[PDB]
C-alpha cells in the first residue's frame, strides 16, 4: 500500500510538473505526453488516468469547469 501511494503521488507530480511547462488539450492530447513520460515507469492505464483527471474539477489548478468539462482554469 505504501509503494502504491508512492506511485500514485509520483504520477501526479509528473503530470503537474510536465503540463506546467507545456500546453493543454481539448479532449485527448495531453494523455499521450503523460503516457510517454510514464512509459518507462509502468502501464499507461488509460481508464484510471481518465477517471482521475476529472476529479480535480471541484478545485482549480487547470480544472475543467463543472458546467462543461472543456474550459480549464488557465
Amino acid at each position: 500500500q505504501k509503494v502504491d501511494d508512492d506511485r500514485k503521488h509520483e504520477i501526479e507530480a509528473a503530470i503537474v510538473r510536465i503540463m506546467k511547462s507545456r500546453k493543454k488539450m481539448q479532449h485527448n492530447v495531453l494523455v499521450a505526453e503523460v503516457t510517454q513520460q510514464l512509459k518507462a515507469r509502468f502501464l499507461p492505464s488509460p481508464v484510471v488516468i481518465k477517471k482521475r483527471i476529472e476529479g480535480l474539477i471541484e478545485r482549480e489548478y487547470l480544472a475543467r469547469t463543472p458546467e462543461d468539462r472543456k474550459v480549464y482554469t488557465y
Binding site: 469547469t65 462543461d68 474550459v71
Partner: protein, 309 residues
C-alpha cells in the same frame, strides 16, 4: 416606420420557406437583426450566476438575406445536463412555449439557437459546428449565436457573434475576414481547426422602441450621474489593444498586397484585401466616434460646472 419590423406576415414566411433561396447560395444569409429584448434576455441568461455555460432557442423570421431574432428562451437542465446535450425535458417545454405564444400573440417560430462562451470569445467549437450543421439539416436555415458574459466585463461591451456553417465538403470561395480574437491555450487549438467551417453574419440592431426604453431607464436612474470622471477610456488597454490590432491587420494587408502585385489575374485576392481595408477602417471609425462622444459629454458638463457664472 420603427415598428414595421414587428408585423408578422405568415403567408410571406410560408412563401419564403417554400422558395428556399438559401439552397441557391451558401452565403445567402448575410445579416442578423436582433431585437433589444432578445439581446437583453440572452445576455441576462448568459450572465446568470457569474460565468455559467448555458444555452437556449431563438424565435424569429427571415427577410431576404437577413435573419431576424425577435425573442429567446431557455430549456430545463436537471443536474446541469446530466444527460446527452443541454436539453433533458426540452421538447415538451419548447412545444408548450410555442403554443402558449401562438395564443398570447407571438407567432414567430424557431430561427436559431444561442449559447454562452464564458471568457473564451465568440466562436463555434467542433460540437457547435456539428450542432449548427444538424440545425442546417432539420429546420432548413438556423443561426448559432454566441455570447461572452465575462468579456461583457473584460472588453466592456462585446458583440453577440452570429454564425452559419458550410456544408460538408464545401470550401469558402475566398471569404477571409482576418479578424483576431484572444482564445485561451486550451481552446485556440479546436478554434483554429474548425474556424473555416463556418462564417460570421453582420449583426445589427434596428432602432426600435425596446432599445431606447432601456437607454432612457439607465440614464434616468443609474447613469443619471454623467460625472464618473468622463473617460473610463483613459485606461489604455482597450483602445490600445484595438489600435494595436488595427495596426497588425493593415500590416498583413500590405504584405498580401505586395505579394499579390506579382500575380496578374487573381481576382479573389483583390476583393479580400479591400474587404480587410474596409473592415479595419470601420473599427477605427467606431473607436473614434466613441472617444468623440466621451469628450462632448466632458466639455459640456465641465464648462458648465466650473465657469457658469
Amino acid at each position: 416606420s420603427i415598428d414595421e419590423i414587428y408585423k408578422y406576415d405568415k403567408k410571406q414566411q410560408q412563401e419564403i420557406l417554400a422558395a428556399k433561396p438559401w439552397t441557391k447560395d451558401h452565403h445567402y444569409f448575410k445579416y442578423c437583426k436582433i431585437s433589444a429584448l432578445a439581446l437583453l434576455k440572452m445576455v441576462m441568461h448568459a450572465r446568470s450566476g457569474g460565468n455559467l455555460e448555458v444555452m437556449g432557442l431563438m424565435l424569429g423570421k427571415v427577410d431576404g438575406e437577413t435573419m431576424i431574432i425577435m425573442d429567446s428562451f431557455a430549456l430545463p437542465v436537471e443536474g446541469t445536463e446530466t444527460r446527452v446535450n443541454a436539453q433533458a425535458a426540452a421538447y415538451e417545454y419548447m412545444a408548450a412555449y410555442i403554443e402558449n405564444a401562438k395564443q398570447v400573440g407571438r407567432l414567430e417560430n424557431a430561427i436559431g439557437w444561442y449559447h454562452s462562451h464564458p471568457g473564451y470569445g465568440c466562436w463555434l467549437s467542433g460540437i457547435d459546428v456539428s450542432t449548427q450543421m444538424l440545425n442546417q439539416q432539420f429546420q432548413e436555415p438556423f443561426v448559432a449565436v454566441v455570447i461572452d458574459p465575462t468579456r461583457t466585463i473584460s472588453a466592456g461591451k462585446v458583440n453577440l457573434g452570429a454564425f452559419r456553417t458550410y456544408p460538408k465538403g464545401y470550401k469558402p470561395p475566398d471569404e477571409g475576414p482576418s479578424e483576431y480574437q484572444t482564445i485561451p491555450l486550451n481552446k485556440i487549438e479546436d478554434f483554429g481547426v474548425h474556424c473555416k467551417q463556418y462564417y460570421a453574419l453582420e449583426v445589427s440592431y434596428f432602432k426600435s422602441s425596446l432599445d431606447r426604453k432601456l437607454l432612457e431607464l439607465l440614464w434616468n436612474k443609474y447613469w443619471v450621474n454623467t460625472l464618473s470622471s468622463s473617460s473610463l477610456l483613459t485606461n489604455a488597454d482597450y483602445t490600445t489593444g484595438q489600435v494595436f490590432d488595427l495596426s497588425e491587420k493593415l500590416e498583413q494587408s500590405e504584405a498580401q498586397l505586395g505579394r499579390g502585385s506579382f500575380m496578374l489575374g487573381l481576382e479573389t485576392h483583390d476583393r479580400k484585401s479591400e474587404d480587410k481595408l474596409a473592415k479595419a477602417t470601420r473599427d477605427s471609425c467606431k473607436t473614434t466616434i466613441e472617444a468623440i462622444h466621451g469628450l462632448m459629454s466632458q466639455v459640456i458638463k465641465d464648462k458648465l460646472f466650473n465657469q457658469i457664472n
